[PDB]
Symmetry: D2
Subunit: 383 residues, 4 copies
């Protein structure tokens, strides 16, 4: 047992911190107010090296130099303190797009699609959810028929796709057989700009305004057999396994939003003077701050636990589920308390505290709701 970070992990931590401080911190309030997805920040982010933390140097990563999942995770958490929208933009690329190519991809697919993503040359997306396939990821309407070419044709739509529009490489799931549903989904790689491949209306979301969420529409889109990721009919397995990893990302995002709120409330409590005393002098305030701190620490070691488990090659399915949920709930509790400590000022979008509360809410929903997290843990528990 050990809870000390390696120097390498600290490098990736400090890395995102400096960026978050000099680039993200100043413009976040503007960008969130206007809902601006700043492609230039993303490009700067992507060139930092964080994207290839745990990937082998073979593909242009720091994996062979001591980088690991926890490094990448630590960065996600750090970025989420400054800008949650950007934090999830990064997390989606690595955990949900690069990873599955890296895991289930052939060397050709890796050399072609993985290395750009690892090197920060391209951005990735994950297109699984659609109107009738939410938590039930098998009510998928999207069809993927085979042609005499040996190529496939996709027809469908995807709803709520993070990084949609802005992304270059999309991992898309389609039903190659709608009889064995759960055993008949196939994963495909789509490049931005494929004929027939279009985008729909942009999502009008409650918070996380710096992240771009958009619909995708597939209209007779023909892709080569080469773009098929993994075996035909093994798509559900691929989605679930990559979602296990992503859950650690969302957990880490939730954690960062929470630490953001605590930091804000702590420094505010010392400056706001009412009844002649700074807020921190009133026992209730102090105790709210201490309790928030306890929850944040509780979530923390669970998030890190999962990242370590993953990098070790140990099954982390339940651990991720646990980290995602405890982290998301903490985020929501801690964030709602933070606004309260700021009084009326917390209700103003001039202050950072309101934003955090709005952001906390998606972490209980996307990448599998907290209820599925209950499903994954209980299923394990009852075996």
């Amino acid at each position: 047992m050990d809870f000390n970070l390696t120097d390498i992990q600290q490098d990736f931590l400090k890395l995102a911190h400096d960026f978050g401080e000099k680039k993200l911190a100043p413009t976040v309030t503007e960008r969130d107010h206007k809902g601006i997805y700043d492609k230039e920040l993303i490009d700067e982010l992507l060139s930092l090296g964080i994207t290839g933390a745990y990937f082998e140097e073979k593909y242009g990563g720091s994996g062979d130099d001591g980088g690991d999942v926890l490094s990448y995770i630590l960065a996600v958490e750090e970025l989420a303190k400054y800008d949650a929208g950007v934090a999830i933009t990064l997390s989606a690329t690595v955990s949900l797009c690069a990873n599955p190519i890296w895991q289930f991809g052939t060397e050709a697919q890796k050399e072609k699609f993985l290395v750009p993503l690892v090197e920060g040359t391209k951005l990735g997306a994950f297109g699984l959810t659609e109107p009738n396939a939410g938590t039930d990821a098998s009510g998928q309407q999207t069809i993927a028929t085979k042609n005499d070419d040996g190529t496939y044709t996709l027809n469908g739509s995807k709803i709520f796709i993070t990084n949609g529009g802005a992304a270059d490489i999309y991992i898309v799931f389609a039903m190659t057989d709608k009889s064995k549903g759960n055993h008949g989904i196939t994963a495909f790689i789509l490049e931005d700009g494929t004929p027939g491949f279009t985008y729909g209306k942009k999502e009008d979301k409650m918070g996380i305004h710096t992240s771009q969420t958009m619909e995708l529409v597939f209209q007779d889109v023909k892709v080569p057999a080469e773009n098929m990721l993994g075996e035909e009919g093994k798509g559900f397995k691929i989605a679930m396994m990559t979602l296990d990893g992503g859950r650690i990302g969302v957990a880490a995002q939730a954690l960062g939003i929470a630490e953001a709120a605590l930091a804000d409330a702590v420094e505010y409590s010392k400056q706001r003077v009412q009844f002649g005393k700074p807020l921190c002098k009133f026992q209730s305030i102090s105790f709210k701050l201490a309790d928030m701190k306890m929850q944040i620490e509780a979530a923390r070691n669970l998030v890190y636990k999962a990242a370590c488990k993953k990098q070790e090659g140990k099954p982390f399915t339940v651990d991720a589920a646990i980290a995602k949920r405890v982290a998301s709930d903490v985020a929501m509790r801690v964030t709602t308390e933070a606004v309260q400590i700021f009084g009326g000022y917390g209700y103003s979008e001039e202050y950072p505290v309101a934003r955090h509360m709005r952001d906390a809410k998606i972490t209980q929903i996307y990448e599998g709701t907290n209820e599925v997290q209950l499903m994954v843990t209980g299923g394990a528990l009852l075996r």
Copy 2:
């Protein structure tokens, strides 16, 4: 003991309901998105009669005809289901402006200022809070000096004033002596358009976008002795007592927002089909709905309790405190759960569920935070 509504109460209930259905419901999403304060809706609202529910016919009200506090409250709750921003606009006028004139005003002040407000001819506001006087309503910088005329001069600012800008009659509190602070605040009536009396920047708030919140600035504003509401140095008493009543309004607002969320989640649970079943078929969903319903009912009888106590002439200080807090907390719990039940769709500002959550948050803050509500109840408890 009796928990049946009078027909008169049901009249005022049905009244706001029809309005909320035909006028508020259609445009709320637009107005909230754009932050539009629609003066025309307010004018329609004000002519409904709700404003004079518990005021004697003497002043143009329904008080002598069987109208009472609970009637006015029931309407507030009802409007809050459709539009929380409009709900608080109404509540502020009656509870926080008309009432104190009605309670501490001379007949001249009533005939001049009360009857318009009661009849729906004018809108009122309550200007107590300022930068250094939040929960500590005695760090008031606003000065009110006496002149050789016998008239007074006001210099100051007020922050976060609901109905600010839009209102006609403002109840403003100023320090006539800054030595006996808590015993040296005086209440004054200000008419919109008084020279020196200006407004500052409009509040950029997290939710409740349909309510207009603005700063007021007093620059050498001279008012006649006639505009002094109550005795000099008795302002704190007047603010507290009127805040006791308003707390029932905010409680009723919180209740309505909660019922709004429950209604949404209930009908959604029946339409959203996942895994082949509507959401309401999964035990967890049903139980979330049932629990939400229990909290809403718990808050409810507490809100009504306070309104009845007030109309009876019984001291309702603690009851209001209890209603305000339990209602606000329920609103926040129930509202956050509602978004969860809607999945990703709840995170979209296209759906009503996100709005409700954003609104719930002010009810724990304005008109005295939930912590002061703890202060008022515990103070009583330890006597």
Copy 3:
């Protein structure tokens, strides 16, 4: 609407308060530690007329003179403050025995059986639960075979019977026809001492030590045709409707336990000093006390509302369900908190606060676990 107790309601309340003060309070710690059921005290309680509060004078009750369900509920609450176990022995009789004979019995069965329960010359009990039928009421295995004599022969047993072994008149449900389970259960008035009617295991329980809980055994118990309550097959309906009323009583007991715990905590926080200040002057303490008070107030008005609807003849199944779950959930919370305020002393069985915690847990389980109340409420909600 009206939240005022009547003269009569206050009389029954005062009545129970003096019995609690004089007869219950001085011995409760002894009786609880030793787990004794004092038949003399119960016979004393029964002689006060509380048992007849809402039944008509023609059965020996105060119903014809202004006594109502609430008066009886106020009594149960009051007794619960002193001795939770005694409160329930009483609640069981009136709500689970006298009520179904009154509500379903023929005038004959009323003259014979109801009169003594109302007058207090006999105690009653409700036998429904079996080892294979707790929450699943339909799992009845006790059979009620019909004989040539138009007689019945009961064979089976009942588990966890409050007042079991100490009651005179029992209401037992048995399967007359096991084809139509939930439509084939029959209720019978079974008298203690009937040949074949034996008692078994006396339950050793965590709390509520002053209440006797016993197993009933039916070995070839012959019952006359005029002991059938209702009619063949409507025994489930009878039990269900009986349980709605019984639940209002349990909600009341739960309320009473919470009130006792709050009062102990307030009184103690005034006296105990640390750091040179009485406990009540530390803000976390006074806030704790305040929250407790708010919760019990939330539960209170739900308890009373349910009692009034029953006495008014309105449908109250759901109000009973909300009351029981909120009141007990509040009890469990306030209870666990009062022990905390007492510190090391709250963990000592010398002080009363641990007993209140032990007692509080049962209010969540018996007369329908809180989860059943959620089932009841949510089902009504989805109708």
Copy 4:
């Protein structure tokens, strides 16, 4: 970072598990019901070498061979699953007695006093609390007067001493100088049987029945100069630093209780059936179980993190504080829930689930109430 137990850690864990399985489990219900402290079992436990896990071979411990604080913590957790009262008698010795002699004692005092505590030939206890000094440690009234012989005379008493009346070696704190309270407390090694050293009230407690809690009485107790631990005036520092470690143990015990309650609930939900389905197939049940599991995981990693920092020599006061409050708060929750899943049977002292609830409450109060942990953490947060 690393969350892997070592071979040695697993050895001490297995060790405690077999003692629990063989010696503790079969008699626990009897011993708990009768409130007996079995000296033979304790002497058995002490002979396993657990007591010496992290102390060096020169005192008879396994510290020089890979035993560490965590190994001892794993033991405490494990024992707590079977007998919470036994777990704490052990925790008290190692953490509250052997540790301060080791950490503050001279080599002489170590050879004499530490050796037997490490070897397990004597039991130890920690006497700090007084009726006028619980949370306010500074309220010490026991005086330690100096004599011509360079000797000390202790006069006073101590309340609530775990292992009191059964311990050989005691650590008592007494005011050497009452001017500088918090800077004038002194620690002394006091041996059982020293003339003047008597015992008093044996506490009758709600739970943890297998633990002996007794009052210590000091009437003219002469102590030799070389029994002073530390030096005049630094007894508060000693006690504080002793309590940080002790708290990691209490967090562990609390963890163990929670784990026992979860396991009972899982095992039961698999077997018990209602409505024709095993309890674990109703979604509210499996979700409950899942949440419980998540909470205990949250607490687990906080408990272990604190243990590692202590063994690593990092500062751990706050980690101890977070661990103790989370673990106990989780215990109280999981505990109250497992009783619910058992239904009517969970309320019976035949089953183990009620004991776990009774035991869980003390983990929130002793070795520093959770409110103190909040004080500790929040203060460090506002530095």
